[PDB]
Amino acid sequence: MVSKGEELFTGVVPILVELDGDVNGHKFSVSGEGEGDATYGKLTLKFICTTGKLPVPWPTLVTTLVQCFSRYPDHMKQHDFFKSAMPEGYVQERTIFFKDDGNYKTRAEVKFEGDTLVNRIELKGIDFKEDGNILGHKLEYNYNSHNVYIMADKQKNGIKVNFKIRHNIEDGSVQLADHYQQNTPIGDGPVLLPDNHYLSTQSALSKDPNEKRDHMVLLEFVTAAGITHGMDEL
Numbered sequence: 001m002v003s004k005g006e007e008l009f010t011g012v013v014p015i016l017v018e019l020d021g022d023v024n025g026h027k028f029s030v031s032g033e034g035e036g037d038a039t040y041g042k043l044t045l046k047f048i049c050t051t052g053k054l055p056v057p058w059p060t061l062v063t064t065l066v067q068c069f070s071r072y073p074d075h076m077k078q079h080d081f082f083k084s085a086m087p088e089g090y091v092q093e094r095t096i097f098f099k100d101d102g103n104y105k106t107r108a109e110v111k112f113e114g115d116t117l118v119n120r121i122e123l124k125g126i127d128f129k130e131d132g133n134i135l136g137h138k139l140e141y142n143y144n145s146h147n148v149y150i151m152a153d154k155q156k157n158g159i160k161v162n163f164k165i166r167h168n169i170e171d172g173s174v175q176l177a178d179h180y181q182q183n184t185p186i187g188d189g190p191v192l193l194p195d196n197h198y199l200s201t202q203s204a205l206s207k208d209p210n211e212k213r214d215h216m217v218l219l220e221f222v223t224a225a226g227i228t229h230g231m232d233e234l
Helices: 005-009 074-079
Strands: 013-023 026-037 042-049 090-098 103-113 116-126 146-153 158-168 174-185 197-206 215-225
Touching: 013 042, 074 215
Parallel strands: 013 116
Antiparallel strands: 013 026, 026 042, 042 215, 090 103, 090 174, 103 116, 146 158, 146 197, 158 174, 197 215
């Protein structure tokens, strides 16, 4: 099946992202805009720190800063929770544990506001080392590919999601960030609850050569996989 929510994503959709953050007491705000094309699992966005210098590395914020733009193949469209919750949207909550360092806890609402898919987030970070990889800005400005593992939480009418991000460091080491996530629908309508599957996620970071503010340009491609081939023909 294809959910009614998925019909909202068959063309190019404008995206807005607003994040209000506080990490070890360093307050900051990020705004982003761009567009997604879930037909190709593609996002293209530019984010700006509107409060000055970002007090954490940009790569640490990529997962917090719209999984409804993932491409689900045909035999797996009945497993797309994220589009099925649209346009009313969903609440996405995480705790992200940076190995040997602090944690982010985030709560976001992802939903349509008019024609635009908007992700509004609050983030709180604590327990960071002032000279660790994060507040000491030792992460390279790049990003790896990851698998985002998804399972249904039928009790909560949503999903539980987990994965481990690898952030590359200049000296050849890696800073690991373990992500524990759950998503729940905002509205009343039925949502699709999936079988166990994963998203294969790729992200590339760049800069706008005419932008003086602290910023990140991001390109992402995300495709779902891993459903056995249960629903062989369906």
